[PDB]
Design an enzyme around this catalytic site. Structure first.
Site, PDB file in Angstrom:
ATOM      1  N   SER A 195      43.408  -0.341 -58.737  1.00  0.00           N
ATOM      2  CA  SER A 195      44.020   0.775 -59.447  1.00  0.00           C
ATOM      3  C   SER A 195      43.008   1.918 -59.540  1.00  0.00           C
ATOM      4  CB  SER A 195      44.511   0.317 -60.824  1.00  0.00           C
ATOM      5  OG  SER A 195      45.335   1.291 -61.434  1.00  0.00           O
ATOM      6  N   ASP A 233      54.568   0.464 -55.975  1.00  0.00           N
ATOM      7  CA  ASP A 233      54.263  -0.835 -56.574  1.00  0.00           C
ATOM      8  C   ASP A 233      54.568  -0.870 -58.079  1.00  0.00           C
ATOM      9  OD1 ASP A 233      52.233   0.610 -57.756  1.00  0.00           O
ATOM     10  OD2 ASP A 233      50.611  -0.699 -57.122  1.00  0.00           O
ATOM     11  N   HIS A 276      51.816  -3.595 -58.779  1.00  0.00           N
ATOM     12  CA  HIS A 276      50.522  -3.196 -59.317  1.00  0.00           C
ATOM     13  C   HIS A 276      49.815  -4.335 -60.056  1.00  0.00           C
ATOM     14  CE1 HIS A 276      47.933   0.312 -59.738  1.00  0.00           C
ATOM     15  NE2 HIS A 276      47.670  -0.038 -60.984  1.00  0.00           N
TER      16      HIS A 276
END
Ligand code: CA
Ligand code: ZN
Length: 387
Positions: free
Chosen positions: A118, A308, A349
């Site tokens: 991320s 995602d 994610h």
């Protein structure tokens, strides 16, 4: 529990860098595990497998600048120095916490593998920039005003990162921030909760450099006056702005590829095309990401719709205006270019770090095999470089 190996299989330690709203080590809660969730303990697994690993601890909400500096001192140890010029400009404290230093020996010649998930992927890139070039504004500031300058902002410090490996990183930002996160209404709510949490000593959101702590012998009136006048509510010096398309691109224009580093991106998609070309969250999409996944699927920018749950595909694949190349797990190694891995259908994610408790389809052994693959790829690099 498990410690690092006496005799590790890798000569360059794997340093993992969490993302936005991420907490590791002793700023985390009860039993929250960022890298693995409930499904696995990736630190235990990699170290039992013979590798020397570390999980960096940086601010949850702070900017990539803040976090990149914190990463340097997390490894090298010392009192965090965000920069005199940078701190003056944005209107916040210059000095942060002091880390002990898990790799005090970190210097040119004894490098590290940086894996980021991320926003951690942005933080890594920004750190490698400051290592190599420093910051011209900081050098100019201490030329002009004197005082001490950090080794990090002096620059000229190469050969300290071997590989940069990002996972679901918004290299080009995300609409989730543009249209939701960094809206005045949402970011107000968030920074207000973080200030309340700092004041109560309840949760460290990594924003105390903005004056969230109350000074000594300070009335509550003065405290509420300082916070109200703080530059935080409008500042671009925040993680939420750096997750914006515009702010991510500001970083893209700063960074350039190092011909001696190996770059690689891992990208996920957990949406499917539907009526009118819109995208909606797959069954199995992490609960808290269903809303953002659906919003991103309907934006005007058609190419940004696959995502995602937080990051669009084309945002994660590589930073715009930087040389890249399609590869897979059996491709030959390439230096100085973003090696774009095939998009992983079904991975959202959170799945990348095992943080989707409800998703039974993603087992603990699948997640473990994924990080095995990454580390095998990092061992390919170490082998290719020695000879
Ligand atoms: Ca999932
Ligand atoms: Zn700052």
């Amino acid at each position: 529990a498990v410690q690092n190996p006496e005799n590790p299989k890798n000569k360059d330690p794997f340093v993992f860098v969490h993302g936005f709203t991420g907490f590791v080590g002793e700023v985390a809660a009860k039993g929250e595990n960022y890298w693995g969730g409930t499904k696995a303990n990736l630190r235990n697994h990699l170290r039992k497998a013979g590798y020397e690993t570390y999980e960096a601890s940086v601010s949850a909400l702070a900017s990539n600048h803040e976090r990149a500096v914190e990463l340097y001192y997390y490894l090298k140890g010392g009192r965090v120095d965000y920069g005199a010029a940078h701190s003056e400009k944005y209107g916040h404290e210059r000095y942060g916490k002091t880390y002990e230093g898990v790799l005090k020996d970190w210097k040119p010649g004894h490098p590290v593998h940086f894996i980021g998930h991320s926003m951690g992927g942005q933080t890594i890139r920004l750190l490698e920039h400051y290592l190599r070039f420093g910051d011209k504004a900081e050098i100019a500031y201490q030329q002009q005003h004197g005082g001490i300058i950090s080794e990090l902002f002096k620059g000229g410090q190469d050969n300290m990162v071997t590989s940069i490996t990002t996972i679901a990183t918004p290299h080009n930002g995300t609409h989730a921030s543009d249209d939701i996160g960094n809206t005045p209404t949402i970011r107000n709510i968030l920074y207000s909760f973080a200030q309340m949490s700092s004041h109560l000593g309840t949760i460290d959101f990594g924003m105390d450099h903005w004056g969230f702590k109350r000074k000594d012998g300070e009335s509550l009136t003065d405290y509420n006056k300082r916070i109200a006048e703080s530059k935080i509510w409008d500042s671009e010096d925040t993680g939420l702005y750096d997750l914006t398309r515009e702010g991510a691109e500001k970083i893209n224009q700063k960074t350039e590829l190092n011909p001696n580093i190996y770059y690689k991106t891992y990208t996920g998609v957990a949406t499917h095309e539907t009526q009118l070309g819109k995208h909606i969250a797959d069954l199995g999409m992490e609960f808290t990401k269903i809303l953002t996944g659906n919003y991103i699927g309907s934006v005007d920018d058609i190419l940004w719709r696959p995502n995602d749950g937080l990051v669009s595909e084309i945002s994660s694949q590589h930073p715009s205006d930087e040389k890249n190349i399609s590869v897979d797990e059996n491709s030959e190694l390439h230096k100085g270019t973003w090696q774009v891995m095939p998009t992983m259908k079904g991975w959202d994610h959170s799945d990348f770090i095992g943080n989707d408790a409800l998703d039974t389809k993603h087992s603990a052994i699948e997640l473990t095999n994924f990080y095995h693959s990454i580390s095998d790829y990092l061992m390919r690099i170490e082998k290719a470089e020695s000879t």
